[PDB]
């Protein structure tokens, strides 16, 4: 843990940015919705991964969120998004697809537009995260995230960590191959 430091970037209206988009780099975004909404944008290129932007808020209406997500996803090279399918993720993921006609959505199946909930995935995901940070394979820069990585037990908020767990689960998958690499 505690070898973790953060860059104290200003909270630009919910959106935290540590690196702006650089052509040639391939990003990936995971979302845990409405507790705050937490949008993690990671750089999966060089197997040094980097958390370049974070969207954090417990005050945006899930009604308008897709617009917010859309903005940042487009901003980072038509970025792929992996939405956890809780009661709200389902609606958000649909808007993102129908309403905003965004096509770079990662799906679990044609019916589930993101990560389908399961005790199995969360667990499996946590583990995958634990070995991404500890091996210094995932570089975190956000203050909140780091604070939650200090009040989140193996078994108070955790949205920013959950968000990074969606990312874990996404790394235990095969499809992750393509999206990866510059
Ligand atoms: Mg949440």
State the total domains in the chain. 1
What is the Å distance from ligand 1's center to 31 Cα?
A: 9
Report yes or no: 108 and 173 within 8 Å, Cβ to Cβ.
no
Range of the domain at 58: 1-182
The CATH number of the domain holding residue 18 is: 3.30.420.240
The alpha carbon of 61 and the centre of ligand 1 are apart by a number of angstroms equal to 13
DSSP annotation string for 25-46 = --EEEEEE----EEEEEEE-SS
Nearest to 31 by CA among 124, 107, 93, 110: 93
If 0-12 CB within 10 Å is exposed, 13-18 middle and 19+ buried, where does residue 162 land?
A: buried
Expressed in angstroms and rounded, the spacing between residue 86 Cα and the centre of ligand 1 is 9
Rounded Cα–Cα distance for residues 81 and 103 (Å): 10
Binding site, annotated residues for Mg(2+) = 32, 35-36, 84, 159
The resolution, in angstroms to one decimal, equals: 2.8
- CA 36–ligand 1 middle distance (angstroms): 5
By what method was this entry solved?
X-ray
- Is residue 141 within 8 Å of residue 6, measured between CB atoms? yes
DSSP letter at 19?
S
Structure tokens at 57: 């808020």
CA quadruple 165, 58, 66, 119: dihedral positive or negative? positive
Instruction: Let me know: does 70 contact 102? Beta carbons within 8 Å.
Output: yes
Mode of pairing for the β-strands spanning 49-57 and 37-43: antiparallel
Ligand 1 centroid–CA 23 distance in Å is: 31
Dist. CA 91 → ligand 1 center (Å): 14
Dig out the tokens for 130 from the structure: 């634990």
Helices (H), 76-175: 89-97, 119-133, 143-148, 159-171
- For 112, 131, 157, 164, the CA distances from 51, given in Å and listed in that order, are 26, 16, 19, 10
């Amino acid at each position: 843990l505690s070898r973790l430091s953060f860059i104290d970037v200003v909270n630009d209206n919910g959106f935290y940015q540590f690196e702006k988009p650089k052509e040639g780099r391939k990003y990936v975004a995971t979302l845990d919705c409405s507790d705050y909404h937490a949008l993690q944008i990671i750089d999966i290129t060089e197997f040094p991964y980097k958390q370049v932007a974070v969207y954090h808020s417990n005050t945006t209406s899930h009604f308008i969120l897709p617009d917010i997500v859309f903005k940042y996803l487009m901003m980072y090279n038509e970025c792929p998004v992996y939405i956890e399918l809780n009661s709200t993720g389902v609606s958000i993921a649909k808007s993102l697809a129908m309403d905003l006609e965004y096509d770079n959505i990662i799906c679990d199946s044609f019916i589930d537009l993101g990560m389908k909930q399961s005790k199995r995935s969360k667990a499996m995901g946590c583990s995958a995260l634990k070995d991404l940070i500890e091996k210094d394979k995932l570089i975190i820069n956000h203050k909140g995230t780091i604070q939650e990585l200090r009040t989140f037990s193996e078994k108070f908020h955790d949205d920013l960590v959950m968000s990074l767990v969606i990312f874990g689960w996404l790394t235990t998958q095969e499809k992750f191959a393509e999206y990866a690499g510059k």
